[PDB]
Structure formats: structure tokens, C-alpha cells
UniProtKB/TrEMBL annotation, chain C:
Annotated compartments: Cell membrane
Gene Ontology BP term (one): antigen processing and presentation of peptide antigen via MHC class I
Top-level lineage group: Eukaryota
Keyword flag Membrane: yes
Keywords: Disulfide bond, Glycoprotein, Immunity, Membrane, MHC I, Signal, Transmembrane, Transmembrane helix
Domain Ig-like: 185-271
Residues of the full protein shown: 25 to 300 of 337
Predominant subcellular localization, coarse grouping: membrane
Protein name: MHC class I antigen
Cellular component aspect of the GO annotation: early endosome membrane; ER to Golgi transport vesicle membrane; Golgi membrane; lumenal side of endoplasmic reticulum membrane; MHC class I protein complex; phagocytic vesicle membrane; recycling endosome membrane
Cysteine pairings via disulfide bonds: C101-C164, C203-C259
Membrane topology classification: Single-pass membrane protein
Organism encoding this protein: Homo sapiens
């Protein structure tokens, strides 16, 4: 299951 | 940039007249764009499949290219690789 | 024993050839189980192991949406990193990210991971505390400040201690017949004369899973690490792996050499010699 809602770099 | 390592081998120990899989494993390379052909007597084998792009702990990429085949004593097999680190394609013969 | 789940993301710009490509692959241990490719005709999270196929449509839709959002997020990140390094719009660049969790035999979290690279070099990594960052350079410090202002480490810790371990345990149960089965190597020793003076002894391990293996040659009981050629462990295409180790030996001294094989699927470690 993937991590949701990543912040961009 | 990092140049690809190349191994050419079969899935199972080769026996003339028995269906097998011919593998070309390319690894250790960066960046990820790469051109790989499997060759039979010098001619490009059509409809070769490959694995999904992934990478190792040192960030270098690896891919497996493969095709079903039946080895014989006459037929020579090879893998041909091009990459930005290579002036011209590298050909690695299947060491039967 | 212990087990791992990992996702591997690659984002690749290609100026003049469209928008950057985003690829994601997921593994449990050495078994790939999902893939996503933004270049596909219709991009979707897609199964690559039989035991994941039983997940319902909500799972496939949710993971597809995350990956489609990541395609856009990683394009923004590529634009940002180009600026952080004062790079022109003409060059192609790559962000790589690996993240996931390890659990022990009881399923407890052993450690979490989140590490990134730019153009193949370490860029930023979450520390083992799951609370602070290590930035490789002053560009990565910009990302670090942005992620500290956003409390991104806290989001990673929540994922790693929760969803990551919970879903890993589910996959290990649903796939137990393969994921919790170690297949031992089939082994043999071959002999290849080089000249009247030397010959090559090669120790083979075939058909093993998982990929971790130790193959060593000893001469008179002493490891010959400097003189042993070890090929990279390579996939067979049927889930299993192959490896060999070779040493050049003086003709007539072959029986002084022993090959030693350690692998999780073996009842006990193996000692092999050439048998003409
Ligand atoms: Na196991």
C-alpha cells in the first residue's frame, strides 16, 4: 500500500 | 554516469531441443535509458520482454530482458547493449 | 524470519520529449508485486504477483490515484531541483526514492526507510529515528527546510508505523506459500582447464529464493576473497536467483579448495569440492 499525500521536494 | 554490467545466460541448464528462456541481465548503470537486443546468429530477436525498471542500494538501475527459445548446437546467441556511456553497442555472446 | 516491503520510484525528465516519466514498483522481500508507469496507454497500478490480485477495486483505484498524483508531484519536484542546482532546461535529470519498512517474525516494526537521490547521488534521507533528515548538500537543505515546515517526517513515521507494517503483514499472509518459503540453491562445482599450469573451479548456486546468499572458496581452510571472482546475483525469471564464484587453482591442487554455501533454505550450510 503506497503512502498518500507526498510533499514535493 | 555508470556503464552497464551484462550477463547472458539461460533460466535452466541448456539442453539442445528443449524449450528454455534466454536472459540478458543489465545492471549497475545510470542513467536509466538503455537499448538491449537479443540476437540469434546476429539477427535481432523480435518480441523480447523485459522487467519493470528498478534500482539497487547504490541507485544504479537493473533490467532483465528475456525470450523463450529452444537451443541447438548450430545457433549462436548474444545480447547487444547500447548506453550513453558506450561509444558503440557492446555485444556479449551466450557462453553455452 | 524478518521481512521487508519497499517501493522504488523513478522520475525522469526528458526535455523536448514530453513531460517527465514516473515509474513505481513495489516489492515484498525479493518479490515484485505491483507496478505503475505514467507512459502506459492507460496508467494504472497493476499486479505483478498472484497474491495481490485478490485485492478489491477500492485498493486498485486508491493506489492508482496516489500514483497519478505522484506523477504530477514528481514533475514539480524535478522543476524545483533543477532550480536548486542552477541547471538549464535542456538537460535530463532523475529523482529516485525508496521507502518502506522491515518487520520481524512477530510482525513488529524493526525499522523504517525513506531515501532519495538526484542524478544517482544521495540527496536526502529520513533518519532511523523517523523524525529528522540528513541532507547531502545545500540544495537538499532547501528540501529539508520545506519538509520540516510541513512536518513531513511525522507523516512518514505515521505511514511507516501504521499502514506499511499493517499491509506488509497482510501481504505475507495472503502470499505465505511463496513469500514465507525459502528455496535452497541447487549447487555444483565445475572445472575449466586454462593451461597445463592452472584451471578454474567454479561453484554454482541455482534456483534459490530469497536472493541473499554467501558463496565462498577456501584454500586449505582459508578464505580466498581477494582471488575469487563473484558474479552479481542474477534473476532466473521464475522468481529464483543464480550466482557463481570462481577461483583459479594450480593444476593438481584442486582438492585443497572447498566451496561453502550458506542460504536460508538449506537445512545446514554446504561444503562442496570438485568431483571428477
Ligand atoms: Na522465509
Amino acid at each position: 500500500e503506497l503512502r498518500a499525500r507526498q510533499e514535493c521536494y | 554516469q555508470r556503464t552497464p554490467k551484462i550477463q547472458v545466460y539461460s533460466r535452466h541448464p541448456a539442453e539442445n531441443g528443449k524449450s528454455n528462456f534466454l536472459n540478458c541481465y543489465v545492471s549497475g548503470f545510470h542513467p536509466s535509458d538503455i537499448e538491449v537486443d537479443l540476437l540469434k546468429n546476429g539477427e535481432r530477436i523480435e518480441k523480447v520482454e523485459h522487467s519493470d525498471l528498478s534500482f539497487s542500494k547504490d541507485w544504479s538501475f537493473y533490467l532483465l530482458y528475456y525470450t523463450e527459445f529452444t537451443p541447438t548446437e548450430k545457433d549462436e546467441y548474444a545480447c547487444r547493449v547500447n548506453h550513453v556511456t558506450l561509444s558503440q553497442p557492446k555485444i556479449v555472446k551466450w557462453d553455452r | 524470519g524478518s521481512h521487508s516491503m519497499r517501493y522504488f520510484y523513478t522520475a525522469m525528465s526528458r526535455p523536448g520529449r514530453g513531460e517527465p516519466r514516473f515509474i513505481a514498483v513495489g516489492y515484498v522481500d525479493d518479490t515484485q508485486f505491483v507496478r505503475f508507469d505514467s507512459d502506459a496507454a492507460s496508467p494504472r497500478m497493476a499486479p505483478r504477483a498472484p497474491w495481490i490480485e485478490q485485492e478489491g477495486p477500492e485498493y486498485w483505484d486508491r493506489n492508482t490515484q496516489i500514483s497519478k498524483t505522484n506523477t504530477q508531484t514528481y514533475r514539480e519536484s524535478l522543476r524545483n531541483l533543477r532550480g536548486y542546482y542552477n541547471q538549464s532546461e535542456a538537460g535530463s535529470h532523475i529523482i529516485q526514492r525508496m521507502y518502506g519498512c522491515d518487520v520481524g517474525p512477530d510482525g513488529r516494526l524493526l525499522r523504517g526507510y525513506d531515501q532519495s537521490a538526484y542524478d544517482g547521488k544521495d540527496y536526502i534521507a529520513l533518519n532511523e529515528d523517523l523524525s529528522s533528515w540528513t541532507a547531502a548538500d545545500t540544495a537538499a537543505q532547501i528540501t529539508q527546510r520545506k519538509w520540516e515546515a510541513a512536518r513531513e517526517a511525522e507523516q512518514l513515521r505515521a505511514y511507516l508505523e501504521g499502514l506499511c507494517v499493517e499491509w506488509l503483514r497482510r501481504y505475507l499472509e495472503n502470499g505465505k506459500e511463496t513469500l514465507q518459503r525459502a528455496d535452497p540453491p541447487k549447487t555444483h562445482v565445475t572445472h575449466h582447464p586454462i593451461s597445463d599450469h592452472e584451471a578454474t573451479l567454479r561453484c554454482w548456486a541455482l534456483g534459490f529464493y530469497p536472493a541473499e546468499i554467501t558463496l565462498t572458496w577456501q584454500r586449505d581452510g582459508e578464505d580466498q576473497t581477494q582471488d575469487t571472482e563473484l558474479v552479481e546475483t542474477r534473476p532466473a525469471g521464475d522468481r529464483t536467483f543464480q550466482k557463481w564464484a570462481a577461483v583459479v587453482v594450480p593444476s593438481g591442487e584442486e582438492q585443497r579448495y572447498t566451496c561453502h554455501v550458506q542460504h536460508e533454505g538449506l537445512p545446514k550450510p554446504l561444503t562442496l569440492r570438485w568431483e571428477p
